[PDB]
Design a protein around this nucleic acid. Structure first.
Ligand SMILES: [Mg+2]
Ligand SMILES: [Mg+2]
Ligand SMILES: [Mg+2]
Ligand SMILES: [Mg+2]
Ligand SMILES: [Mg+2]
Ligand SMILES: [Mg+2]
Ligand SMILES: [Mg+2]
Ligand SMILES: [Mg+2]
Ligand SMILES: [Mg+2]
Ligand SMILES: [Mg+2]
Lengths: 122, 64, 95, 95, 46, 72, 201, 87, 242
RNA sequence: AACUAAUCCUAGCCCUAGCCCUACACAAAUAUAAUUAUACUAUUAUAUAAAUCAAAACAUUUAUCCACUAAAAGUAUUGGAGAAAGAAAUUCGUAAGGAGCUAUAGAACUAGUACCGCAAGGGAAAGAUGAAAGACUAAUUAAAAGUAAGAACAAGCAAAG
């Protein structure tokens, strides 16, 4: 006679049964049943200063939209790194070892914002 | 010049092109040609269909 | 009797008949006399003489055996020196 | 070893075919138990002088069990193989 | 007495007996799940 | 990583962040990414169930073309 | 859904929810499938009625329900009905247009009033244009007001609306830095700690 | 209407590709190879020498013949002894 | 509907698709080329023809292998192809009596064997049949190398086969170190079984183990596109200057 | 002179033929009492299929269940030599459609849903306007049983002469 089709949540079951609704944990439970919040585990919203901002939620109809071109890795490379290498190649001051000079990162370890695996949320 | 028998022009199931028989024979013939390429449930039903027909045609009927 | 066999779909011969009866192509069947090898020491000489003979079958018995045997056992067999050569045909019978 | 034979014959299968079995082809009778059979002997040529069974360089026969446990493994004796006999026969000749 | 009230609901009893973890414990229970997935059932277990 | 569950399917497994290696984690060594032989029969049945469904759809589209050609 | 009939009312209106309840199982309409390239009827194009009540009368397309291969012409194939009927008042009698299938109408030669058949063909610039099968000519796409009703040219800038020039402004600088790294540098946040090793699995 | 061209059996020798797993096995045995030669002769491409048994194959046939099919003299010799025993 | 291929051919297609196909050619041949194991529990027909006593006519005869059950414990021992015979018997050896279940078991023994090539002594569960086979092979090492995969009937034995073959193939100095004379003798004595090193590695491995071995060999972290574009750019610039 | 009702055509389905597959579904969560972001206690199919049923019982036994077409051949063989079972050698072969279904039919299916059982599991029913509903949802029919319109009037298988 139990309803099998309804979702299993903490409102149901005895007192002992509990579970989260998806809220991210922000602290630790120490011995003796004491909660110790950790400030670093609490997200902090980085909010910019909007003074002098010239952009509003809606855009004018008169303004014409452009052609959609999903950005690709090749396109970014040509814009940023290709010109430096091209000029350097003419000057001859280019070597395989110093690709980092143009911005190459050998490993993501040591970066605050690791590209992969991502260590930063949206 | 008898190059092709007319039976070769029939379009139908592989196990009964140019052949005719009663259902029990038809059941066994379907198994022979495509017994190894049949689905599990279809093969199970065919096996049961054969066993039913066998006991009917070989143990029942008005004439002995 | 197996009227329709699974593997081939044909009628099956009963081998109890093949081992007891001989069919002549005309349609007659031959058989032995039951007990011709049994307790011969208490049977009379005339009694034993009858048993040794080969006997024919009736229309019903012949009809039965024809249902229990397949056509292969009803064909013509051209055996050289056959001791049943002359008996496969009926002659001077009006009926 | 246990050597078994079926009670029910298996119809011939052909050349490129396998003899599909049935539940009656799993009834076995005991052909022979090889363990009870009389045992052979083990022929081995000594690599080192053996105790009371000969001197080194002499081919000897042992009762199977004795050779395997000690002579074959402890290095006292070596297998009497073709090459082994050939090599030792050279030492025997050069004496 | 009066029958008909055999079902004495307890969520701890229910989930232990016919739950997801209980079913996966044994292969005989996993084959219960496997058939239910074949049929198309809304709920595979409790 | 592409891995197989105990129900005989290929499932894309998203990894999680852990403070200890996998071989020392006793909750990871309760999850199973393999299938026993008894899932073999069920694997084939899904193939046939999908094959049946796919066959019916193709036949249905064929009829709809016939109706259109009859109409026009 | 398999059982959904497209009618004359714009989908999602009160009329279309009333006509098509979730339990509706009306007989499907059979529509000759027409490729996107094949279709040549567009809103605003003058067409002529091949057959019907108003056969031989030219009209202007004002609606195209491609799901039903329908083209609606203003003031033609028009029957009568009462709009705004109330319990107190009968309402106002109006003449309501009825949908026409494409094969019952034809496009009109831009210069001359005749039902000239057209074919799709490219131009020197490469833009696809309709060309008359006979008396080959370019019939331009007819400019029509947008369904939303917003008029671009007359639109006046207001609060919460960006100026046209401001939107056109481009300031993206291609650089191998994420948004998470550009903001901190611009906003001057400094963090020297680094996350400990994590065993992903 | 004009009828389609009459159905025709494919002419010339036929050699299947052994790679394909659905090709019937009997269509790949050496016996099937000889059939190709007989039907179309040289155009089959079968090495004519291959038709005759190979030396290892030849020993197989010769070994069997001695085992089961004796010589004329042996048959006559045994028959005489049997008559003598019966006599 | 109908499957395009018969069910029994599915295994072959499985080997022919995906990473399975990429496995080395010689290993794939090993799996499919399963040769009936040598008779152990039945006496094979000496001839292909026999004279039936009843009718006295020449009749073809065939050898039908007895089904034997190999418990997984056997994979960790060295049985000479032996296994469990699960069958039925007629009480009192007459078919008119009841049919009774019977299981015939091998008299397993545990002994210690020394491998010259490995120079290590293993303790293994071994039947008297294997002991005779080892004696007829004139050494434990000869027995492992000579016996094919099927006749051996053990996963433990196959690992020994790979270990011995790899030892001979590489001429590893780890065999009897600091005594080169001793090492040379062993290698020469078993020189006949030497095979190429690459082939030796793929000996006795199962499909899963071979699949795991291949996956590890082909595992590689994705190349950064940065480098890939740089290589293309440099080549184009170099060619233009040329 | 009508209530209850009835009429209806396409939703899908069936059997073949061809064809191995490469439909493995953003992001997030789930083996913990599944779908709960992090450590605790770690994780692993199965020894021979049985029986019904047939032998007018039953006890040995009992096709399919459990390796190319046709021929040899239901032959040789096997079998409480009963019911029954049953070869091979050796020959032969280049291989998209509907005298199907049309809503009690065809799949159980509008759905493995509602509902029922603690669970394994079992398992439905039904829809119908027109070109346009941005034309006040059509039609169509003395037509089933059941009623009404219109209770009954000595006497009786209810009718027949
Ligand atoms: Mg044959
Ligand atoms: Mg109850
Ligand atoms: Mg209670
Ligand atoms: Mg029994
Ligand atoms: Mg009975
Ligand atoms: Mg009884
Ligand atoms: Mg139905
Ligand atoms: Mg139903
Ligand atoms: Mg009525
Ligand atoms: Mg009256």
């Amino acid at each position: 006679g139990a309803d099998r089709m309804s979702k299993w949540t903490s409102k149901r079951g005895p007192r002992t049964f509990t579970k989260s609704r998806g809220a991210k944990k922000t602290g630790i439970y120490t011995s003796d049943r004491k909660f110790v919040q950790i400030k670093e585990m609490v997200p902090e919203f980085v909010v910019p200063d909007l003074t002098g901002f010239k952009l509003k939620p809606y855009v004018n109809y008169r303004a014409p939209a452009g052609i959609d071109t999903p950005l690709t890795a090749k396109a970014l490379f040509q814009e940023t790194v290709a010109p430096a290498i091209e000029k350097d190649f003419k000057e001859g001051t280019f070597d395989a070892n110093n690709l980092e000079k143009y911005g190459f990162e050998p490993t993501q370890e040591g970066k605050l914002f690791q590209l992969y695996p991502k260590n930063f949320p949206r | 010049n008898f190059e092709k028998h007319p039976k070769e022009l029939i379009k139908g199931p592989v196990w009964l092109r140019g052949w005719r028989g009663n259902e029990l024979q038809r059941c066994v013939r379907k198994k022979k040609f495509v017994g190894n390429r049949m689905f599990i449930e279809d093969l199970h039903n065919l096996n049961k269909r054969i066993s039913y027909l066998y006991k009917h045609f070989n143990r029942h009927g008005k004439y002995r | 009797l197996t009227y329709c066999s699974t593997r081939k779909g044909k009628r099956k011969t009963v081998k109890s008949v093949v081992h007891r009866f001989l069919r002549l192509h005309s349609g007659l069947w031959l058989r032995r006399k039951a007990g011709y090898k049994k307790k011969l020491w208490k049977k009379s000489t005339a009694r034993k003489k009858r048993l040794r003979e080969f006997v024919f079958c009736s229309k019903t018995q012949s009809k039965l055996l024809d249902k229990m045997t397949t056509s292969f056992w009803k064909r013509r067999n051209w055996y050289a020196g056959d001791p049943y050569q002359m008996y496969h045909d009926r002659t001077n019978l009006r009926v | 070893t246990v050597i078994v034979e079926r009670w029910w014959k298996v119809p011939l299968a052909g050349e490129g075919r396998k003899p599909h079995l049935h539940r009656r082809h799993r009834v076995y009778k005991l052909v022979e138990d090889t363990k009870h059979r009389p045992k052979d002997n083990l022929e081995l040529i000594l690599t080192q002088s053996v105790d009371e069974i000969g001197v080194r360089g002499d081919l000897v026969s042992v009762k199977k069990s004795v050779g395997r446990n000690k002579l074959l493994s402890q290095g006292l004796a070596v297998y009497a193989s073709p090459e082994n006999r050939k090599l030792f026969e050279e030492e025997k000749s050069l004496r | 007495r009066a029958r008909g009230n055999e079902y004495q609901p307890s969520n701890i009893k229910r989930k232990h007996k016919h739950g997801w973890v209980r079913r996966l414990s044994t292969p005989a229970g996993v084959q219960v799940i496997l058939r239910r997935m074949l049929k198309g059932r809304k709920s595979l277990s409790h | 990583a592409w891995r197989r569950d105990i129900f005989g399917r290929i499932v894309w497994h998203k990894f999680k962040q852990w403070p200890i290696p996998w071989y020392l984690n006793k909750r990871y060594n309760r999850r199973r990414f393999f299938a026993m032989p008894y899932v073999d029969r069920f694997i084939r049945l899904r193939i046939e169930k999908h094959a049946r469904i796919e066959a019916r759809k193709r036949s249905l589209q064929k009829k709809k073309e016939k109706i259109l050609h009859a109409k026009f | 859904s398999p059982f959904y009939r497209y009618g004359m009312s714009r989908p999602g209106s009160i009329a279309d929810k009333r006509k098509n309840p979730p339990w509706s199982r009306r007989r499907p309409v059979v529509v000759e499938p027409i490729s996107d390239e094949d279709w040549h009827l567009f809103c605003g194009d003058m067409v002529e009625i091949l057959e019907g009540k108003d056969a031989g009368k030219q009209g202007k397309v004002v609606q195209v329900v491609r799901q039903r291969n329908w083209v609606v012409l203003e003031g033609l194939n028009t029957h009568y009905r009462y709009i705004g009927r109330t319990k107190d008042h009968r309402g106002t009698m109006i003449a309501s247009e009825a949908p026409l299938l494409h094969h019952q109408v034809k496009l009109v030669d831009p210069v001359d009033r005749k039902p000239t058949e057209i074919q799709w063909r490219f131009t020197e610039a490469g833009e696809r244009v309709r060309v008359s099968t006979r008396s080959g000519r370019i019939i331009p796409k007819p400019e029509f007001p947008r369904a939303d009703g917003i008029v671009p040219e007359t639109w006046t800038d207001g609060p919460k609306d960006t100026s046209v020039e401001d939107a056109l402004e481009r300031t993206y600088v291609p650089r191998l830095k994420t948004l998470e790294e550009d903001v901190m540098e611009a906003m001057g946040i400094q963090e020297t700690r680094r996350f400990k090793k994590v065993y992903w699995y | 209407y004009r009828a389609p061209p009459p159905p025709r059996r494919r002419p010339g020798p036929h050699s299947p590709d052994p790679e394909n797993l659905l090709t019937p096995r009997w269509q790949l045995t050496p016996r099937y190879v000889a059939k190709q030669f007989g039907r179309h002769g040289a155009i089959s491409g079968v090495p004519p020498a291959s038709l005759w048994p190979t030396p290892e194959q030849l020993r197989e046939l010769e070994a069997e013949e001695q085992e089961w099919y004796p010589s004329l003299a042996t048959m006559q010799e045994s028959l005489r002894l049997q008559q003598q025993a019966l006599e | 509907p109908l499957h395009r291929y018969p069910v029994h051919l599915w295994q072959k297609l499985r080997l022919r698709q995906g990473i399975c196909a990429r496995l080395p050619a010689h290993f794939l041949r090993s799996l499919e080329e399963e040769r009936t194991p040598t008779p152990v529990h039945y006496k094979p027909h000496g001839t292909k023809f026999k004279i039936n006593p009843k009718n006295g006519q020449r009749e073809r005869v065939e050898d039908v292998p007895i089904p034997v059950h190999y418990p997984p414990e056997s994979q960790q021992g060295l049985w000479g192809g032996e296994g469990l015979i699960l069958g039925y018997r007629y009480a009192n050896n007459d078919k008119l009596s009841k049919r009774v279940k019977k299981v015939w078991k091998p008299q397993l023994f545990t002994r210690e064997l020394y491998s010259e090539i490995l120079d290590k002594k293993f303790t293994v569960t071994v039947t008297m049949r294997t002991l005779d086979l080892i004696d007829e092979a004139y050494g434990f090492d000869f027995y492992i190398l000579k016996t094919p995969k099927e006749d051996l009937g053990s996963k433990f034995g196959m690992d020994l086969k790979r270990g011995m073959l790899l030892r001979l193939a590489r001429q590893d100095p780890h065999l009897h170190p600091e005594n080169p004379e001793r090492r040379a003798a062993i290698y020469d004595k078993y020189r006949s079984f030497v095979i190429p090193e690459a082939e030796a590695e793929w000996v006795g491995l199962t499909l899963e183990e071979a699949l795991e071995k291949q996956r590890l060999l082909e595992e590689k972290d994705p190349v950064p596109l940065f480098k890939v574009y740089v290589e293309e750019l440099v080549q184009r610039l170099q060619e233009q200057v040329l």
